[PDB]
């Protein structure tokens, strides 16, 4: 479907809700809110960090490589000529 009333068939489902004016906007934002954010962070931590850690290694290595490439060499006129 494409409009409310003829989208899908459902049965035997009950919902309960409460008015915005009868409940708080920041309930258990520290007892329950902070723990949940931490859970999410750890659940998706080792799936992302390693790739960016690798990127840093190449970045540092390549930058340092370029610096060495422009540093005077002792071989330069090592024959005193």
């Amino acid at each position: 479907g494409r409009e409310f009333g003829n989208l899908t068939r459902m049965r035997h489902v009950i919902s309960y809700s409460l008015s915005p004016f009868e409940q708080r906007a920041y309930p258990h934002v520290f007892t329950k809110g902070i723990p949940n954010v931490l859970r999410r962070i750890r659940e998706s931590f080792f799936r992302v960090v390693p790739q960016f850690v690798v990127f840093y290694l190449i970045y540092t290595w390549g930058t340092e490589e370029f610096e060495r490439s422009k540093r005077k060499n002792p071989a330069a006129y090592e024959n005193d000529k």
């Binding site: 035997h12 489902v13 009950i14 919902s15 309960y16 809700s17 409460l18 008015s19 915005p20 409940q23 708080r24 906007a25 920041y26 309930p27 610096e67 422009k70």
Partner: protein, 241 residues
Amino acid sequence: SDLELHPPSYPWSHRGLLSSLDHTSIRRGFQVYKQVCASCHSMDFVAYRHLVGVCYTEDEAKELAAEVEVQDGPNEDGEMFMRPGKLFDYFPKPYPNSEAARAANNGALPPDLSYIVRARHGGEDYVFSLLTGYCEPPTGVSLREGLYFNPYFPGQAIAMAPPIYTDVLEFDDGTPATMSQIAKDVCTFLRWASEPEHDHRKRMGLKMLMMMALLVPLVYTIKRHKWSVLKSRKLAYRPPK
């Protein structure tokens, strides 16, 4: 030749996230520009105005703008006479064309300074170190007599001679004419010439920060208020059984 020597990060009065320029330093920096810079460096996009509300008073600006003659339009016959100069006039050009400038500067063309600070990498840090650093050439390196060895210059061979030294000019404020002091003042003046909206920009930023700090919590609270109907709704499944 080798990788450019990076100037250090000097502590500037205006480097703070909210700091503003020191206008007395700007006044002194301009006074330096009139004598040493004006001889062979141009400032095309700055008029004798723009100073009334910054350093100099309106009457002082009039007195100063009248000090130098400027070219005017045609006369009855069609000849061009010279006016005493007005506020709307821009700073005089040292040379008519780039060819004359280079001819008098041993081929090197002194760039216009109106945007030099925001053009060169490193900002005024580059300029200050550039003026303060004129080292005697190391052993094993030679250069044309006209050229001068300055490590911060990307060619390490700059045609410009040391522009400043102790007691080149006496400031009206009475502060000593130390070479370091002169360099700092002119750098402040150039910073202003490139970013005249500096002070106002930061004032707007301060107001924006406080307004945002107030607003963001409120709008988030409104969103939480509206969505609370869904963030706490409870479901159940009671099949006929």
